[PDB]
């Protein structure tokens, strides 16, 4: 069965870092 | 100059075949993990986040985050350009840098991107790793395989893989420098020792011939550059046949319809000439000019989608090419079985199953000319007869068309030629 899963991604910019939660099909 | 789809992508109402319609295409199995409107990190024309607005084959219409006017959008090739899933630049230690136009547009880029990405869809982390893996061919350079002689289709000649473009192989014959292009999944190529067990005519070196003859069951002499059965896609299994492989389905002299292997624009009445083993059989197109050498006989398997029961063209309204000595208007099967006194092949002998192939009339795709497999041309689905397709070349006559199966390895999604670096033949000037 193919379902959605929560994926914690990181994003880099000057001069800090943060994280957002997105969706990916698996 | 290879034809570019760009001026045709831009236009609205441009219907294009989705990648999922092509079982042999790369990234076909992971195309369901990709949907319209997913956020992706893309090369900044340094990477920036964008949205996939449209997906036409491999071509993807993309728009940056921060641009809300559909005037700065751009088309990309999904499997070629530097496109990744969100969060990839972070792992590669690369910062996401906004385009020059909108670099001053928003105040807090944190809450902007967070807002755009919170609960947004994206590609799986292992998406393009599965793409490149799907690009590889099962065959390598130097492999030897039996394949249909294009100068004598009644026999198979020993040939060698001397060039691989994506998954299309260039097979150079053994005794010659002449050869032909062929997709790895096509049924005209066969493993070493295929003609020997099947009972098909074989042309090969004297040593190879003795090698096939000397072999006894599962222990036959195999060399380091021999392409064996593990590399060949079949439409059946040997489980369906007995040990000896002696089939009792079709019989010699049975009549049926079949796609002309030499003229793909024609379905014609055909005759079962020689029944080989494991369901393989040598048939002859009836429209063929007379030949007593039997060199015009061609091998179709009994589970081929390119053979049909008689009357298939009449039922589904297809212009059937009449046999030699018969005219178009003055031809019926009843009148033809009267003349020859031959029984038509049973309806049960044919097992046709129509898959949800999702091909619709008007869908643009890239098709390879069977009679000149060096060329993959711009094409369009003209008809959809069950699982059988009628592919037309854009800018040419309706006689240059070709009846291909929905799961043919000769049809490719739009932008395939750009993906595998193949030259795409466009409409004439």
Curated annotation (Swiss-Prot), chain A:
Segment forming the signal sequence: none
Q: Where in the cell is it found?
A: Nucleus
Q: What does this protein do?
A: Polycomb group (PcG) protein that binds to the 5'-CNGCCATNNNNG-3' sequence found in the regulatory regions of many genes. PcG proteins act by forming multiprotein complexes, which are required to maintain the transcriptionally repressive state of homeotic genes throughout development. PcG proteins are not required to initiate repression, but to maintain it during later stages of development. They probably act via the methylation of histones, rendering chromatin heritably changed in its expressibility. Probably targets the Esc/E(z) complex to DNA. Proposed core component of the chromatin remodeling Ino80 complex which is involved in transcriptional regulation, DNA replication and probably DNA repair.
Quaternary context: Component of the Esc/E(z) complex, composed of Esc, E(z), Su(z)12, HDAC1/Rpd3 and Caf1-55. This complex is distinct from the PRC1 complex, which contains many other PcG proteins like Pc, Ph, Psc, Su(z)2. The two complexes however cooperate and interact together during the first 3 hours of development to establish PcG silencing. Component of the chromatin remodeling Ino80 complex. Interacts with Sfmbt to form a pho-repressive complex (PhoRC).
Identify this protein by name: Polycomb protein PHO
Organism whose genome encodes this protein: Drosophila melanogaster
Traced from the root, the source organism's taxonomic lineage reads: Eukaryota, Metazoa, Ecdysozoa, Arthropoda, Hexapoda
Q: State the covered range within the intact protein.
A: 145 to 170 of 520
Swiss-Prot record, chain B:
Q: What residue spans do the MBT repeats cover?
A: 3-99, 107-205, 213-323, 331-427
Q: What is its main location?
A: nucleus
Q: Per the UniProt record, which residue ranges are transmembrane?
A: none
Give the Gene Ontology MF terms in alphabetical order.
chromatin binding; DNA binding; methylated histone binding; zinc ion binding
Its BP terms in the Gene Ontology are: heterochromatin formation; imaginal disc growth; negative regulation of DNA-templated transcription; negative regulation of gene expression; oogenesis
Q: Does the keyword Chaperone apply?
A: no
- Keyword list, A-Z: Chromatin regulator, DNA-binding, Metal-binding, Nucleus, Repeat, Repressor, Transcription, Transcription regulation, Zinc, Zinc-finger
Where found in the cell? Nucleus
An example Gene Ontology cellular component term from the record? PcG protein complex
Coiled coil ranges (UniProt) are: none
- Oligomeric and partner information: Interacts with pho as a component of the pho-repressive complex (PhoRC).
Role description: Polycomb group (PcG) protein that binds to the Polycomb response elements (PREs) found in the regulatory regions of many genes. PcG proteins act by forming multiprotein complexes, which are required to maintain the transcriptionally repressive state of homeotic genes throughout development. PcG proteins are not required to initiate repression, but to maintain it during later stages of development. They probably act via the methylation of histones, rendering chromatin heritably changed in its expressibility.
- Annotated domain remarks: MBT repeats have unique discriminatory binding activity for methylated Lys residues in H3 and H4; the MBT repeats bind mono- and dimethylated H3K9Me1, H3K9Me2, H4K20Me1 and H4K20Me2 but fail to interact with these residues if they are unmodified or trimethylated.
Q: What is this protein called?
A: Polycomb protein Sfmbt
**What is the species of this protein?**
Drosophila melanogaster (Fruit fly)
UniProt gene name: Sfmbt
Q: Which residues of the full protein are shown?
A: 534 to 977 of 1220
């Amino acid at each position: 069965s193919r379902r959605w899963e929560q994926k914690l991604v990181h994003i880099k910019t000057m001069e800090g870092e943060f994280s957002v939660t997105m969706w990916a099909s698996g | 100059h290879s034809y570019d789809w760009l001026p045709r992508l831009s236009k609205e109402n441009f219907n294009a075949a989705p990648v999922t319609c092509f079982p042999h295409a790369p990234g076909c199995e992971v195309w369901d993990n990709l949907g319209v409107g997913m956020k992706v990190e893309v090369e900044n024309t340094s990477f920036w986040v964008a949205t996939i607005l449209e997906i036409k084959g491999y071509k993807a219409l993309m728009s940056y985050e921060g641009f809300d006017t559909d005037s700065h959008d751009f088309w990309v090739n999904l499997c070629n350009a530097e496109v990744h899933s969100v969060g990839w630049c972070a792992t590669r230690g690369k910062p996401l840098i906004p385009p020059r136009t909108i670099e001053h547009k928003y105040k807090d880029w944190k809450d902007f991107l967070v807002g755009r990405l919170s609960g947004a869809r994206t590609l799986p982390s292992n998406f393009y790793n599965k793409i490149n893996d799907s690009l590889q061919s099962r065959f390598r350079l130097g492999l030897n395989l039996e394949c249909v002689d294009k100068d004598r289709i009644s026999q198979v000649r020993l040939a060698t893989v001397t060039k691989i473009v994506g998954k299309r192989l260039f097979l150079r014959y053994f005794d010659s420098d002449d050869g032909f292009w062929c997709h790895e999944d096509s049924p005209i190529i066969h493993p070493v020792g295929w003609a020997t067990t099947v009972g098909h005519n074989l042309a090969a070196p004297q040593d190879y011939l003795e090698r096939m003859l000397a072999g006894r069951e599962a222990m036959i002499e195999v060399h380091e550059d021999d392409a064996t059965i593990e590399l060949f896609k079949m439409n059946f299994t040997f489980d369906e046949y007995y040990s000896d492989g002696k089939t009792n389905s079709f019989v010699e002299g049975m009549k049926l319809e079949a796609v002309d292997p030499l003229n793909l624009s024609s379905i014609c009445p055909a005759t079962v000439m020689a029944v080989l083993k494991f369901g393989y059989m040598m048939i002859r197109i009836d429209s063929y000019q007379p030949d007593a050498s039997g060199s015009d006989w061609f091998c179709y398997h009994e589970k081929s989608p390119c053979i049909f029961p008689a009357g298939f063209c009449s039922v589904n309204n297809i212009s059937v090419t009449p046999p030699n000595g018969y005219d178009s208007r003055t031809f019926t099967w009843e009148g033809y079985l009267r003349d020859t006194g031959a029984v038509a092949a049973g309806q049960h002998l044919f097992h046709r199953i129509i898959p949800d192939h999702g091909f619709e009339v008007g869908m643009s795709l890239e098709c390879a000319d069977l009679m000149d497999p060096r060329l993959v041309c711009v094409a369009t689905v003209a008809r959809v007869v069950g699982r059988l397709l009628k592919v037309h070349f854009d800018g040419w006559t309706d006689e240059y068309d070709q009846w291909l199966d929905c799961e043919s390895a000769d049809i490719y999604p739009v932008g395939w030629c750009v993906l595998v670096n193949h030259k795409l033949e466009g409409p004439p000037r």
